[PDB]
């Protein structure tokens, strides 16, 4: 999965997340056409309670049916302020997409970080099942982990999450200023 953000001088903003699911999708290509086939079917619940490539489970809501589109976690998003473009954000990462995007937004609005800081900031993740608090290397100091562990969280350090490409637009006296950021994770 990969995400891109675009914003122009006219006020238009486009947030796009697209994919073939896993890296190189199904790994199978269409002979003569030169493109890789997706393996998006795995985003369907192929069996109740069965966790997919990202540990996500499902029942009937996401079962397989002809012409049905499989459930996705992609969260292309646009945040507005006074009906004007403020943030254009999105990211890849299977189940972690929702939490990654959410943290970047919170970082800007809650902690007043600029888009670069918001994106660079360490990220954590909780997806109910497994019952763990996923964190990144160097992302959480001992004091914090100790207090969270005392609360009942099972902390686990795993590969960095996401690859956010975001834009922040701020109103200028005469026009607008565009601030962007690519993810130092990939």
């Amino acid at each position: 999965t990969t995400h891109y953000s675009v914003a122009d001088r006219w006020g238009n903003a486009v947030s796009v997340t697209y994919t073939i699911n896993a890296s190189y999708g199904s790994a199978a290509s269409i002979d003569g056409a030169g493109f890789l086939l997706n393996n998006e079917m795995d985003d369907f619940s192929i069996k109740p309670g069965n966790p997919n490539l990202y540990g996500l489970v499902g029942g009937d809501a996401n079962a397989i049916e002809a012409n049905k589109r499989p459930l996705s976690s992609m969260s292309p998003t646009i945040v507005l302020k006074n009906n004007k473009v403020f943030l254009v954000v999105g990211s890849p990462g299977g189940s972690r997409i929702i939490t990654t995007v959410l943290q970047v937004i919170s970082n800007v609005i809650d902690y007043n970080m600029n888009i670069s800081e918001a994106v660079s900031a360490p990220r954590f993740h909780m997806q109910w099942l497994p019952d763990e608090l996923r964190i990144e290397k160097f992302g959480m100091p001992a004091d914090v982990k100790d207090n969270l562990t005392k609360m009942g969280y099972q902390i686990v350090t795993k590969p960095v999450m996401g690859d956010v490409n975001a834009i922040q637009v701020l109103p200028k006296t005469k026009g607008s200023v565009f601030y962007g950021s690519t993810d130092p994770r990939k």
């Binding site: 990969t2 995400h3 891109y4 675009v6 914003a7 122009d8 001088r9 006020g11 238009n12 947030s15 796009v16 697209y18 073939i20 890296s23 999708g25 199904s26 199978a28 269409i30 002979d31 056409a33 030169g34 493109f35 086939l37 997706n38 393996n39 998006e40 795995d42 369907f44 499902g58 029942g59 809501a61 397989i64 002809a66 049905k68 589109r69 996705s72 646009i78 945040v79 507005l80 403020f86 995007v101 959410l102 970082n107 609005i109 809650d110 007043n112 109910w128 099942l129 608090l133 969270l148 609360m151 975001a166 834009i167 922040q168 026009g175 607008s176 565009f178 601030y179 962007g180 690519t182």
Partner: protein, 347 residues
């Protein structure tokens, strides 16, 4: 640390330099955000094959100059011949990698239809021109980056299982591409030229459709010309929410992301996170518990809204979030085993 900056034509950012530059140049040349987005979509399908594509699908959330917020659903569709237990053996057991590797693990591609859909409705430039850069990259090739040599190597095992991929993603003798190698994709160029000339039909019809069906049939896949001809994007209404005075516009079903993003944000809004600042265990605890409930809800209420009932409005209702927040204990968690989808509410 300093963020990218622009005060003239705006910004076009992707995960690949060549694709971003391509989009930026479209902005510099006068195109709008959509023109640039379409240009990037095809560029990435060439220079970032691990994710960028024309054989997959995705979503697009758009804010128009006139204040309208629209969502474009170009997610793949299960084939016409797809069945509920198509990936299970004659004992209800999951057939290993049948839904991960191979032709049967594929849904009908919508990316191409998506690019043309948003271009025709909100673009200003002609596809033929916005696709030329990608075509050039496919025809003349580009340098395999450091990260690509890696990912390509980690996928070697998978490619080997299919002749088609062995021919396109390996050098003579099925040798992996190395950092710096010039990667040329002639057949992809032909396909792109088909789209450049005939538009979306150049993909879902004619020769390309023929190649897809015949190769599918030949390999145990079920996608047919009937599927391709019937693929349709779907303009949907984005899921909307608010967070401390900001309007949140995200993707609606078939995506669960926008709904749960707004849901979790709603729960967090009940606390003054700014007080303790970034990284405080108190703030992480609130967000993590919100996440915990949201993912539980996801496992039961989320699916393609065209086929099932999805309680979007209820999940993003702030009163429901307030009910979740009130269950969050100051120094203890709610084990996932004790979590209940919907909290019993949602009725």
């Amino acid at each position: 640390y300093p963020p990218i900056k622009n005060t003239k034509v705006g910004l076009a950012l992707s995960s690949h330099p060549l694709a971003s530059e391509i989009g930026q140049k479209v902005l510099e040349e006068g195109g709008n955000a959509i023109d640039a987005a379409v240009a990037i979509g095809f560029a990435l399908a060439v220079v970032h094959p691990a994710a960028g594509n024309i054989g997959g699908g995705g979503f697009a959330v758009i804010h128009l100059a006139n204040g309208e917020n629209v969502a474009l659903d170009f997610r793949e569709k299960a084939p016409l011949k797809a069945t509920k237990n198509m990936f299970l053996d004659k004992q209800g057991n999951v057939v290993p990698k049948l839904s991960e590797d191979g032709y049967l693990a594929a849904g009908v591609p919508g990316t191409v239809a998506g690019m043309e859909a948003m271009l025709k409705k909100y673009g200003t430039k002609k596809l033929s021109q916005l696709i030329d850069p990608a075509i050039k990259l496919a025809e003349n090739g580009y340098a395999i980056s450091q990260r690509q040599a890696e990912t390509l190597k980690e996928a070697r095992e998978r490619f080997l299982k299919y002749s088609s991929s062995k021919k396109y993603f390996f050098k003579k003798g099925h040798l992996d591409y190395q950092e710096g190698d010039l990667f040329v994709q002639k057949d992809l160029a032909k396909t792109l030229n088909q789209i450049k000339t005939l538009g979306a039909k150049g993909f879902y019809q004619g020769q390309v459709a023929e190649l897809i069906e015949k190769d599918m049939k030949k390999n145990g896949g079920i996608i047919t010309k009937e599927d391709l001809a019937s693929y349709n994007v779907k303009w949907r209404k984005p899921v909307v929410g608010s967070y401390r005075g900001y309007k949140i516009i995200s993707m609606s079903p078939p995506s669960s992301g926008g709904t749960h993003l707004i849901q979790i944000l709603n729960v967090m809004e009940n606390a003054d996170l700014s007080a303790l600042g970034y990284g405080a265990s108190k703030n992480i605890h609130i967000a993590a518990e919100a996440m915990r409930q949201a993912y539980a809800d996801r496992s039961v209420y989320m699916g393609d809204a065209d086929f099932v009932s999805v309680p979007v409005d209820k999940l993003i209702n702030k009163a429901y979030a307030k009910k979740i927040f009130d269950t969050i204990q100051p120094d203890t968690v709610t084990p996932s085993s004790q979590i209940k989808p919907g909290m019993g509410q949602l009725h």
